[PDB]
Design a protein around this ligand. Structure first.
Ligand SMILES: [Mg+2]
Ligand SMILES: [Mg+2]
Ligand SMILES: [Mg+2]
Ligand SMILES: [Mg+2]
Ligand SMILES: [Mg+2]
Ligand SMILES: [Mg+2]
Ligand SMILES: [Mg+2]
Ligand SMILES: [Mg+2]
Ligand SMILES: [Mg+2]
Ligand SMILES: [Mg+2]
Ligand SMILES: [Mg+2]
Ligand SMILES: [Mg+2]
Ligand SMILES: [Mg+2]
Ligand SMILES: [Mg+2]
Ligand SMILES: [Mg+2]
Ligand SMILES: [Mg+2]
Ligand SMILES: [Mg+2]
Ligand SMILES: [Mg+2]
Ligand SMILES: [Mg+2]
Ligand SMILES: [Mg+2]
Ligand SMILES: [Mg+2]
Ligand SMILES: [Mg+2]
Ligand SMILES: [Mg+2]
Ligand SMILES: [Mg+2]
Ligand SMILES: [Mg+2]
Ligand SMILES: [Mg+2]
Ligand SMILES: [Mg+2]
Ligand SMILES: [Mg+2]
Ligand SMILES: [Mg+2]
Ligand SMILES: [Mg+2]
Ligand SMILES: [Mg+2]
Ligand SMILES: [Mg+2]
Ligand SMILES: [Mg+2]
Ligand SMILES: [Mg+2]
Ligand SMILES: [Mg+2]
Ligand SMILES: [Mg+2]
Ligand SMILES: [Mg+2]
Ligand SMILES: [Mg+2]
Ligand SMILES: [Mg+2]
Ligand SMILES: [Mg+2]
Ligand SMILES: [Mg+2]
Ligand SMILES: [Mg+2]
Ligand SMILES: [Mg+2]
Ligand SMILES: [Mg+2]
Ligand SMILES: [Mg+2]
Ligand SMILES: [Mg+2]
Lengths: 159, 185, 172, 58
RNA sequence: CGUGAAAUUGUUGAAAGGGAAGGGCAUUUGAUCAGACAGGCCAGCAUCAGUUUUGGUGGCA
RNA sequence: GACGUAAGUCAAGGAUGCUGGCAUAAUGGUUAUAUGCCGCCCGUCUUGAAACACGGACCAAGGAGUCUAACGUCUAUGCGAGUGUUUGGGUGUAAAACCCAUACGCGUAAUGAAAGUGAACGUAGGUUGGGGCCUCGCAAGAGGUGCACAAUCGACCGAU
RNA sequence: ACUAAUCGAACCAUCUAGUAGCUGGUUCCUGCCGAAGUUUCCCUCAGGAUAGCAGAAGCUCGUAUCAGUUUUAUGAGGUAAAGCGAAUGAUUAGAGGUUCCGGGGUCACCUUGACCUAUUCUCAAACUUUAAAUAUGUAAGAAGUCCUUGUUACUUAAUUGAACGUGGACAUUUGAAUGAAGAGCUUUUAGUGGGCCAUUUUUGGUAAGCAGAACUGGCGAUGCGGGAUGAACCGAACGUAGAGUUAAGGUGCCGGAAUACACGCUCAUCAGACACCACAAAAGGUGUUAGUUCAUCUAGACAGCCGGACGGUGGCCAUGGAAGUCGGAAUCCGCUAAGGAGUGUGUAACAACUCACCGGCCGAAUGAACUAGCCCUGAAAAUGGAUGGCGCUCAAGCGUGUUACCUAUACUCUACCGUCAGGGUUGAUAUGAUGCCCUGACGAGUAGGCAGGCGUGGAGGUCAGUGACGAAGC
RNA sequence: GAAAUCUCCAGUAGAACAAAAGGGUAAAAGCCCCCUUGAUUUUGAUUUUCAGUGUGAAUACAAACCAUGAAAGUGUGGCC
RNA sequence: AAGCGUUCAUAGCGACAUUGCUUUUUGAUUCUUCGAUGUCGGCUCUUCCUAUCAUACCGAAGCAGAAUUCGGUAAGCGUUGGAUUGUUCACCCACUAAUAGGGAACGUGAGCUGGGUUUAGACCGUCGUGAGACAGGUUAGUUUUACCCUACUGAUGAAU
RNA sequence: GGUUGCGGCCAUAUCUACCAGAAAGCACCGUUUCCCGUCCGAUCAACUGUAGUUAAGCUGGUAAGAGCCUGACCGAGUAGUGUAGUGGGUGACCAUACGCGAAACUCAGGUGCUGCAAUCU
């Protein structure tokens, strides 16, 4: 009848990329993980141990435990009408640092630099980001740019 | 028609009055309603809300609990305020001379406080001598130490007390509670 | 889709660092108002160039009035329209005092004779023919005869009252 | 007598009338599932710093 | 054989009735009925306020 | 708020002024009827009832979540580390009311199958918050103390 | 079969009010809130437990840990599309080379099959190098950032790190937008656990008012205006009223509101007036309208029906007889402004009638293949009947455009009722503090929950209540 | 001999990996050889199904004792 | 419209394909009815449809005449008597102008009949150890009520 | 800048064909007593850098090279797709409005870059 195994419906999820099979490169093994790091989960089909379930493919969590060759990650999973804390033991091949944390960790650094520069003079230096603003008024010249365009074209068969 | 974002006609969910029909408690609520409205002291608003509470919401406050709070730095001379019952406690042997204002005193608690040199007053006497609650220290008894709280949140792995009448061997110490008998919790 | 106006809509791509001052394209649009005029401009500019309203802008909107609004002209309107089973190009010849009135007449004509809504009409071109006998349609050429005269038989007279005491006539 | 087998109809409306809740994070999370060797040493590390402030602040 | 209901019935009186009857809103007609003179009833006009509707005309871009 | 030099006035935090008729079925209410429009027979099971589903010819009277033992939550009341007089006894204006000894029930200790053992390193701990209170402040705030409660790491007791 | 109108186990009484997951019924009012037909498990499938949805009691606090939403940044996915001179698997067609079991054919072969090489046609739910849209994870800070140094039995060659800290610095632009109706938390319990319908995606099936899924919105549980009529469609959700404005739909009349204005199309001896929806197709029509492409024509084009129908010639074989018109074969120019081995009608066959081809008569446009609007053919069912009806034809039909107008329990304003929330109010509040008053918002509802009240029998108290001068009842 | 043993060249896996299918694997996860018993002990934690119950299966550890290897390391049954 | 039709696609036919209609077949569905809408056939009687068998008037033909075939208007009017079978269906005899097809709750059981199916008796064959089973055969087997309303057929009748 | 050792990303690095390479290094090469492994000092082990060679490896260059990589108002705002209508059409389906938006195709460019240490006319 029905089949609901652990790795069911993962035919394409756990495939390697084209011309990217074989051994895992050494960068994944030299990355250092610490408790509190924000990591993205993407399972490697070549590594069958410490391998996340198909639910956590594409999920982002926080490192709570650091082990010999694995990482404990906290993921909030929606069950019914609430979220539930989940804890995975994943080998480092299946995780990587989520790059979103690194730009934010550079924005806080750049925020402190702007505030320290603004400390002596020039207060209110707009620490917050703003959305895209409506465009301001400008002048467009026709020097070398005289408008010239045709009307809609008639219908040809093209075949 | 209005696209309602919240439930309409919702009561606040807080007591605006005591459910008790005690005429003297209604007079205490009547006095502290005026004080909470005619003063800006947050003490009067806390006391008025505590006068509305049910019996399980105002657990007894031990004199030992009162004495421990008076061991705080700079609190040795404050008027302890208990909106509820102050009970006795024989496990302590050194009570200090302090003033306690409480809704109710047990016979032993009144004897112990008076014998130590202190004074037992009611909440209306507290209002006359401390209209803004000056130099007062509100004390509340343990609310989750009730026996009914043990059974709240029953379930697997929760570590709560089962709702049971007879205890001991042959009463829920078998399959479901140990690995040798099926499973554990 | 009211009484039409002609609009001189000029737009361009948003300038970038690599290629500032883009080619700044222009179209002539028949529309009931400027909101439809900008919408029609972007629609036709989708057919021609790799652009859209999010990646471009409108630099100018200008109503175009008839140069000589009160002289009767013969107009040749090229139009591409979608029928129930195919797209066709046809040519209509219209006699009226303005391009907006000629275009309004063609929208009435294509809806009446081909059931082609404003939705499925592409006004390819509106070009006044300068000289007589370059006109190609007999239904407009017949009005270009010397000293044209004609009566209006069977005049129908409207009565405010519901009853008439005369049994009237249709003379004219 | 056949009946309906399964449907997730109304199950998201039901789950949203009480407003799906995040798991209520805290400072100082539980050390459950943390490596025992780290946890055993962290007990001795917290004890020593508690004595360090006790010896100084007093 | 205390009182003496209703269903159902007789008489009298009133009303209406083209293949049901009954009902809701509003008013006509007929019948019947309560209160108030130390303001009660129904209205008319003027000057205003609130909400609107329908015109006339003026000055600007 | 406006006008007025001011007094004061005004269309400015909600109608006043003047005048007539009647003072009774005139207005109104109730009822019958007529007219305009609308209105399918209730109860029930059901995804769906006016149904060619079922019960119901009519009327009166009777007619269906009660009591008890034990118990969960919540609330009120008394007393409170205790509490519960009413099995009994005393007494009585006599099935009432009033009074009371010793036990017993539950609670104040848990844990283990059991033999058994049995709850303070510390200001009954440390950390993060926490109402209220105190001190300094015109205040905003800052500092101190922080009950209940929430999280966490410990300590103690029983089992292994 | 019969065994007292009783027989596939009589009658009587008791156990017995036997049990029933099954059927029926389950009695006053108003106010507030308000569902589910889904998860897992069960000798479970007409049931229950469990979780979810709902009510009530609240509690701790007082604008926040937040959000059925977006942005910014960073992930994830393998469907729509696409691809097959890219892999796998199908698949059409020839080319060129080649050598072995393949071709009789050297004893090295125009007239060969595989195989290889470069091309070519078409495909895939269980193919794929690519690869969206929609949906989806995370982050956008005081639980933060930086500096210095303290603990450890962990860890390091080593305070090197790890984790947690002491002390110090940073503030309303504190680290995007919008909103926030208070926020968080707990206990307890009802009903429900038969679903159905619509758009879109989608499975089986020829299909179904069929059976089964996904997301959402609804009906159930819901009246109101509109679709004549209808559970679900459109519009809009509902205290009691007044006034105004509208939605969807309409304005010949029934019927409130223009037999309005404007441009066209259509004439049906089955017109048409169908969002859902209550049907119609391929194929056709010198009906009528509009259009596309090609050609001819004022040097007088098409037609009108005026004149010539030519040499070998009665063209060869043969047909009883075929001579321009039975067939095989033919189709040469002697050629003319002009007449074919004739467009047809014909005779035994010729002959003859009559035309493409050409003018002594014209005079303006013509011919062909098509494209799609309306109308028509295709178009047959049973009681008499249905654009809702009457009727409607430069419409009261169809297509499109512009205004004016009509009216929902919808929107705006006001009043009144109730509910909820936030408040005021004690030196006579000029005695109701669960009272009086101010302010704002809100009002649908089955199953169900809670609250405030009405009524009946009897009981304690009170009104030294009513009453034979009339209680109760009717 | 199309073929029985030997030799070389090409060969991205078109093979093999117990058993269905999918995924994974080339100085290997396939073949051969050598050693071996980690298919061991004691608990908690986690993932899937899920009520966040049970069972099955799996994941990372910790505290032991071992196997192997020059070593790093690997190993708590079967590449998933 | 490839072909048949001596030649000739369309007099009459018509392959390979393809578009429909009907609800008198049978499937498919399970919406209504299980506090029951009397389940086959026939007889009787009325009406309706047209996809026309005959009859009326026509058009076409490979229509000389006769007889036929195809097609149109057309449901006005008719469409039978019998052997066998419970039969619907079928087959045959025979007459005729013709023996066309259907619907009306597969029209019509308070109209009938009861041959059939379809209770209980009984026999046979096969199957089953058996009780028994068989859309297998065979035989016997209670067909209730209208006096109400409407409809219909007839009959009176107030008021002008 | 060449070369070597250990690498990072893992074809712009691969593949095919043909040419160059001083110096150093790498390499081929020479030998079999010992440790070691074989049917076979071919591989593997050891020994001498000696008897020699850039022939190969390696490196770089050459190719309207195959492949790969990058970009393109190249195709294409096309296919597709979210949302909306009492839109069209008997239908299959299609158009429009507010948004997002490919792949193939065609061109153009390119054919490794770089870290630590050592070494070199
Ligand atoms: Mg599977
Ligand atoms: Mg394994
Ligand atoms: Mg079900
Ligand atoms: Mg009597
Ligand atoms: Mg009576
Ligand atoms: Mg009426
Ligand atoms: Mg009246
Ligand atoms: Mg009606
Ligand atoms: Mg039932
Ligand atoms: Mg049903
Ligand atoms: Mg009903
Ligand atoms: Mg029933
Ligand atoms: Mg009955
Ligand atoms: Mg009865
Ligand atoms: Mg009664
Ligand atoms: Mg007593
Ligand atoms: Mg006991
Ligand atoms: Mg018996
Ligand atoms: Mg009973
Ligand atoms: Mg019984
Ligand atoms: Mg509500
Ligand atoms: Mg709720
Ligand atoms: Mg998929
Ligand atoms: Mg596809
Ligand atoms: Mg696919
Ligand atoms: Mg049920
Ligand atoms: Mg229901
Ligand atoms: Mg309708
Ligand atoms: Mg309706
Ligand atoms: Mg809509
Ligand atoms: Mg509507
Ligand atoms: Mg009217
Ligand atoms: Mg109309
Ligand atoms: Mg309500
Ligand atoms: Mg009684
Ligand atoms: Mg009386
Ligand atoms: Mg069904
Ligand atoms: Mg019956
Ligand atoms: Mg016919
Ligand atoms: Mg019948
Ligand atoms: Mg009958
Ligand atoms: Mg009968
Ligand atoms: Mg019979
Ligand atoms: Mg009768
Ligand atoms: Mg009879
Ligand atoms: Mg050698």
């Amino acid at each position: 009848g029905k089949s609901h195994g652990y790795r069911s419906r993962t035919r394409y999820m756990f495939q390697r990329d084209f011309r990217k099979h074989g051994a895992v490169h050494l960068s994944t093994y030299l990355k250092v993980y610490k408790v509190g790091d924000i990591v993205d989960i993407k399972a490697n089909g070549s590594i069958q141990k410490g391998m996340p379930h198909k639910f956590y493919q594409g999920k982002t969590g926080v490192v709570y435990n650091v082990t010999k060759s694995s990482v404990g990650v906290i993921i909030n999973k929606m069950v019914g009408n609430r979220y539930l804390e989940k804890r995975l033991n994943l080998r480092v091949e299946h995780i990587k640092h989520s790059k979103c944390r690194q730009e934010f960790l550079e924005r806080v650094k750049a925020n402190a630099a702007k505030r320290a520069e603004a400390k002596a003079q020039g207060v209110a230096v707009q620490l917050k980001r703003q959305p895209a603003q409506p465009r301001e008024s400008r002048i467009v010249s026709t020097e070398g740019n005289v408008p010239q365009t045709l009307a809609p074209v008639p219908y040809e068969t093209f075949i | 028609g209005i696209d309602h974002t919240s439930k309409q006609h919702k009561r606040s969910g807080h007591r605006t009055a005591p459910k008790s029909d005690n005429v003297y408690l209604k007079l205490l609520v009547k006095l502290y309603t005026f004080l909470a409205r005619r003063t800006d002291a947050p003490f009067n608003k806390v006391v008025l809300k505590a006068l509305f509470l049910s019996k399980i919401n105002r657990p007894p406050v031990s004199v030992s609990r009162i004495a421990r709070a008076l061991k705080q730095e700079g609190a040795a001379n404050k008027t302890v305020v208990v909106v509820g019952t102050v009970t006795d406690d024989a496990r302590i042997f050194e009570f200090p001379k302090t003033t306690v204002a409480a809704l109710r005193f047990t016979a032993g608690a009144r004897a112990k406080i008076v014998k130590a040199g202190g004074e037992c007053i009611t909440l209306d006497q507290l209002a006359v001598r401390a209209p803004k609650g000056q130099n007062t220290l509100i004390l509340r008894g343990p609310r989750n130490s009730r026996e009914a709280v043990r059974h709240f949140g029953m379930g697997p792995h929760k570590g709560k007390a089962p709702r049971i009448l007879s205890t001991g061997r042959k009463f829920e110490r078998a399959r479901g509670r140990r690995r040798s008998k099926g499973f554990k919790v | 889709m009211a009484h039409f106006k002609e609009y001189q809509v000029i737009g361009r791509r948003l300038p970038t660092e690599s290629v500032p001052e883009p080619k700044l394209f222009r179209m002539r649009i028949f529309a009931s108002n400027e909101v439809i005029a900008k919408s029609r401009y972007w629609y036709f500019l989708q057919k021609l160039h790799k652009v859209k309203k999010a990646s471009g802008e409108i630099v100018s909107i200008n109503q175009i009035n008839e140069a000589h609004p009160t002289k009767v002209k013969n107009f040749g309107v090229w139009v591409r329209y979608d029928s129930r089973s195919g797209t066709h190009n046809m040519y209509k010849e219209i006699r009226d005092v303005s391009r907006v009135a000629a275009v309004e007449t063609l929208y009435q004509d294509m809806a009446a004779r081909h059931r082609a809504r404003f939705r499925s009409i592409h006004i390819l071109k509106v070009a006044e023919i300068e000289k007589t006998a370059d006109v190609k349609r007999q239904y407009v050429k017949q009005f270009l005869t010397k000293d044209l005269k004609f009566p209006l038989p069977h005049r129908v007279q409207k009565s405010t009252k519901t009853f008439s005491y005369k049994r009237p006539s249709t003379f004219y | 007598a056949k009946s309906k087998n399964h449907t997730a109809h109304n199950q998201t409306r039901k789950a949203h009338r009480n407003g799906i809740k995040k798991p209520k994070t805290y400072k100082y999370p539980s050390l459950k599932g943390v490596d025992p060797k780290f946890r055993r040493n962290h007990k001795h590390a917290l004890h020593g710093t508690a004595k360090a402030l006790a010896a100084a602040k007093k």
